[PDB]
Amino acid sequence: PIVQNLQGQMVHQAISPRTLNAWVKVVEEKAFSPEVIPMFSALSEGATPQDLNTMLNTVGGHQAAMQMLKETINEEAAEWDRLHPMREPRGSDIAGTTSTLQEQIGWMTHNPPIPVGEIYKRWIILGLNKIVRMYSPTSILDIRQGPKEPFRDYVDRFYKTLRAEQASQEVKNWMTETLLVQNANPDCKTILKALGPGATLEEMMTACQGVG
Amino acid sequence: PIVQNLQGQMVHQAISPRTLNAWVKVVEEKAFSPEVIPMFSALSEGATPQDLNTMLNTVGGHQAAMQMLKETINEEAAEWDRLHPMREPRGSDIAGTTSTLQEQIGWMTHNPPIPVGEIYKRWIILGLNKIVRMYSPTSILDIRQGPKEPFRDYVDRFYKTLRAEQASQEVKNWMTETLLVQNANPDCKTILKALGPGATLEEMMTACQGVG
Amino acid sequence: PIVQNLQGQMVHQAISPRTLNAWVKVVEEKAFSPEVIPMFSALSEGATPQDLNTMLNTVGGHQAAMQMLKETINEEAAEWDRLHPMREPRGSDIAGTTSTLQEQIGWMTHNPPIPVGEIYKRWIILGLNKIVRMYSPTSILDIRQGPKEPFRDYVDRFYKTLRAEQASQEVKNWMTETLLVQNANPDCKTILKALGPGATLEEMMTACQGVG
Amino acid sequence: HQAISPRTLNAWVKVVEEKAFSPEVIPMFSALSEGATPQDLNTMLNTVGGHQAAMQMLKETINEEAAEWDRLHPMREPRGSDIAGTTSTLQEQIGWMTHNPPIPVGEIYKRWIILGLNKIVRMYSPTSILDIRQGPKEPFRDYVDRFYKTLRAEQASQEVKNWMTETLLVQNANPDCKTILKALGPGATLEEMMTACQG
Amino acid sequence: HQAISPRTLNAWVKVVEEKAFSPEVIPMFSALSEGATPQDLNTMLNTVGGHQAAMQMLKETINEEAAEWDRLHPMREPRGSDIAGTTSTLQEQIGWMTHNPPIPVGEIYKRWIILGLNKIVRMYSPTSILDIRQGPKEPFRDYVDRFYKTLRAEQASQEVKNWMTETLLVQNANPDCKTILKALGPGATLEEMMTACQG
């Protein structure tokens, strides 16, 4: 990150070792669940591109994931260079491989600031979303409430898979409205259909509390 | 949060990356148990509205929960604007979407301080209470001691569900006084009725120690 | 690590007690999984050779692991002294046993910096790679998808073992391309062969989602 | 104004009775009712003999749409009941379509009827698209035909329909066909899908 | 603008229903849709009940042809979707037809539909031409009629079609007709083959 000096100069504060260790734990233990994206967003708050590259050096242990992460970063950099044909930050400068750290500080501290950090964070989040989409164990259509599974657990699994699949907004709305009811077990599906169309998730959860 | 400079000026200290990661872990892993409210209160100590919005960007992954969190925030903001018809902080300013950070510092550092942070924290806690009330797996009437469940575990589950359901104070007192005894298994229910009315929880727990 | 003083002098900041405790937890609890190398890389960011020796004092509890870690460090130091026949840092100085801390600061703060810390980190990572290669439970050829194991879990186990075995790059590419398909169960192996040669891991994972 | 042809009326009644309510009824109605006035539309609806429950639902939906029109809009301007043709006369209905700028009362009523018929078709479909699934020995061509008929009777949005087309067709097939479809993999076209799945 | 006749619409639906997708449906469509606009062609396709697999394939081929037209050609000009009528409107279609020189969106869409229907017929050929074998007692008349119906359905290239007519016709005949055809020899026209093979 970037922190004011005692005299006010913005000097780069290196990302702490335990923050990197936490990111490593998320990458290794979590097996690219849908929750690695909120955790990445939390850990990389205010991180510069050099810090983001330091973090991706930990996910570099995985071959395919790092490969398509860098390919998505390259695609986004090409898009930026198309939109954007000290020096102005180029697409490769945002990646923190051709630019130097002092240039990163100058870009992040400008008036208004040049959000190179947030741009690179968004690109990396797109790559992580693709990786998460690969690693999901089951598609949304596979999820179905068990004979005795409570509706809370089934809804949690359904929304986890929905976050994993990353469908469009309208498709997601239709899925949450209809496919959730369709996949529910018959005992709860009866109450879900009794509630009728337009049933908010609050009503669906309260009505099915303890049915299983 | 807000921290004094070396020269004494109150400069905003950004919420640490690991604090945000801890909040993300609470949101994702805990599945909105009743304990996410104490954990939110601990993590957001002294947080400004911008920090609270940064934290809610992590719970934004959930659709319905974030939706009714923002709707409860809007209701509370409307209530504030009804009560309240640099500039005085408006309801939307408390939400940290129309106000700027420097205005937040000015409001929090006033003499006496304008507790915008605590007000927004209370609103967010109301929203989280509603979300927790949805996600409870069973109602209070469902809880019942098992054939061999120790009374300590049964009381812990009962009080967890009681925190989840968030009934009124008088209703909560009646429930803890009577419904706890009623739902207990017969072997412990005999001792509970033998103790008679007005039995404090200490006496009930000590009398039933090791009965199961 | 090394941190600027209030007056700008680079004074050594001792590695925090909790960072050492985290490294101890990684060494003891993880049983030298393949993930101890990313975790070591994260924890030892910017660490000087004295800090690295302090960290290896924790892995010194294990006899054989510490023995071959120090033997690999000695081999790399001999290689450095062959390449390299205040004073210039010698191979033993990089190990942080003959050099003093102030010399380490002088070497790390030079223009351009003398990356003694990163060199020693690379040597220690080579030693840890050897130790991990010993402690792997099964060879790559042993891994095989179960009758009902999802392809995601099987791929995760396969890539964990691949990281453990540390084969050459071409051998690793051939293994991931062919041995992964060969070891898969017949139901998924049919789809893997149907995809044909040159199937990227993304296509293989998406095609086999939910087959088990 | 020209009266609706008796041949056209007989064709409309015949297709309604024969098809009961299949998804083709909506384009058939749109084709037959080209430029028709509300009087002619009411004639076409009233002339239907059977399926009087469905005709009652169509009347109810027309009433709801008329109420919504009256809510939004509280010769003379036409109200909802005027658009429905219950109150408007034939001369009045010739009016409102020649003012230029007009208010196409006939097309506005046709829209309400089309919405009602979409509801009727969606209910009359035998099963939902998610419930549609290939049999153990069903031919894949027949299963595709049933699936796309149900999808036509679905009433979902266009993006949702595209997602259904891409995913559910592969997902719902029996394992013998599903293995072949998975081997073909994503991005394949329906022609390749059945030519591979011909067996 | 002239709306399409209910008689013509019902004739198209009836011929599709009764002939399934025999090769004559392509010329029947070309005849009935003469001068039709994109809206009229969309009605013509949508009104077809059953064979929704084939209608889906026609829609997919329409989308592919629209995409190719868009790459070839990247009031507003017509896109492929506009030509297909999904995005454009009847007023814009009439304007494109009326422009000097005109942009024949109707003929382009008809060509796309004809390509789709050709693919449909090629698939819906019930049996491959290699399996058309004369029975022990079947007339050569019925045998060659079946053979040429299948050959029209297959829609193979000219050279392979000529080879088929030269070789498979005599190869697949029953022994009684096979001997006569072999004695007659190669380099023969169909009228010669049939008039020699009578009885």
Short mmCIF file of N, CA and C in Angstrom, two decimals, chain E residues 10 18 28 38 40 55 57-58 67 69 72 74-75 90 92 119 128 149 157 159 166 182-183 196:
data_model
loop_
_atom_site.label_atom_id
_atom_site.label_comp_id
_atom_site.label_asym_id
_atom_site.label_seq_id
_atom_site.Cartn_x
_atom_site.Cartn_y
_atom_site.Cartn_z
N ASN E 10 -52.73 -21.10 -44.26
CA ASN E 10 -53.20 -22.44 -43.94
C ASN E 10 -52.67 -23.46 -44.93
N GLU E 18 -48.43 -32.31 -43.67
CA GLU E 18 -48.67 -33.57 -44.36
C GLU E 18 -47.41 -34.13 -45.01
N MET E 28 -42.30 -25.28 -52.54
CA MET E 28 -43.59 -24.79 -52.06
C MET E 28 -43.42 -23.49 -51.27
N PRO E 38 -39.96 -9.56 -44.52
CA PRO E 38 -39.44 -10.31 -43.37
C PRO E 38 -40.49 -10.61 -42.31
N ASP E 40 -43.71 -11.09 -42.88
CA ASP E 40 -44.54 -12.16 -43.42
C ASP E 40 -43.82 -13.50 -43.36
N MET E 55 -37.79 -26.00 -36.86
CA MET E 55 -37.93 -24.55 -36.78
C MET E 55 -36.78 -23.93 -36.00
N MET E 57 -33.76 -25.15 -35.96
CA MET E 57 -32.61 -25.20 -36.86
C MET E 57 -32.68 -24.08 -37.87
N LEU E 58 -33.88 -23.81 -38.37
CA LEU E 58 -34.06 -22.71 -39.30
C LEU E 58 -33.72 -21.38 -38.65
N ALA E 67 -25.30 -13.19 -39.14
CA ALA E 67 -23.95 -12.87 -38.70
C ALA E 67 -23.01 -12.72 -39.89
N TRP E 69 -23.80 -11.90 -42.95
CA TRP E 69 -24.15 -10.65 -43.62
C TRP E 69 -23.60 -9.45 -42.86
N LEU E 72 -19.93 -9.21 -43.57
CA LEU E 72 -19.71 -8.77 -44.94
C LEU E 72 -20.07 -7.30 -45.13
N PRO E 74 -20.38 -4.53 -42.36
CA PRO E 74 -20.43 -3.98 -40.99
C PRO E 74 -21.08 -2.60 -40.93
N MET E 75 -31.73 7.13 -43.75
CA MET E 75 -32.19 6.16 -42.76
C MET E 75 -31.12 5.09 -42.52
N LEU E 90 -41.83 -3.01 -39.67
CA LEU E 90 -42.47 -3.12 -40.97
C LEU E 90 -42.27 -1.86 -41.80
N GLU E 92 -39.65 0.20 -41.70
CA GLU E 92 -38.28 0.17 -42.22
C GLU E 92 -38.14 -0.85 -43.34
N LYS E 119 -30.82 -27.88 -45.44
CA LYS E 119 -30.21 -28.68 -44.38
C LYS E 119 -31.25 -29.58 -43.72
N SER E 128 -30.74 -43.44 -46.11
CA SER E 128 -29.65 -43.12 -47.02
C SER E 128 -29.87 -43.82 -48.36
N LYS E 149 -36.28 -40.13 -55.43
CA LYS E 149 -36.73 -39.33 -54.30
C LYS E 149 -35.63 -39.19 -53.26
N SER E 157 -23.30 -33.55 -54.54
CA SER E 157 -22.75 -32.79 -55.64
C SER E 157 -23.12 -33.42 -56.98
N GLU E 159 -21.16 -34.42 -59.56
CA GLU E 159 -20.35 -35.56 -59.99
C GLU E 159 -20.75 -36.83 -59.26
N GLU E 166 -25.39 -43.60 -62.40
CA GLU E 166 -24.77 -44.54 -63.33
C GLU E 166 -24.59 -45.92 -62.71
N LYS E 182 -27.39 -54.78 -66.91
CA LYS E 182 -26.01 -55.09 -67.24
C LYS E 182 -25.85 -55.41 -68.72
N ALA E 183 -26.80 -56.16 -69.28
CA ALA E 183 -26.77 -56.45 -70.71
C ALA E 183 -26.91 -55.17 -71.53
N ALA E 196 -36.29 -50.28 -71.46
CA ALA E 196 -35.72 -51.61 -71.61
C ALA E 196 -36.12 -52.53 -70.46
#
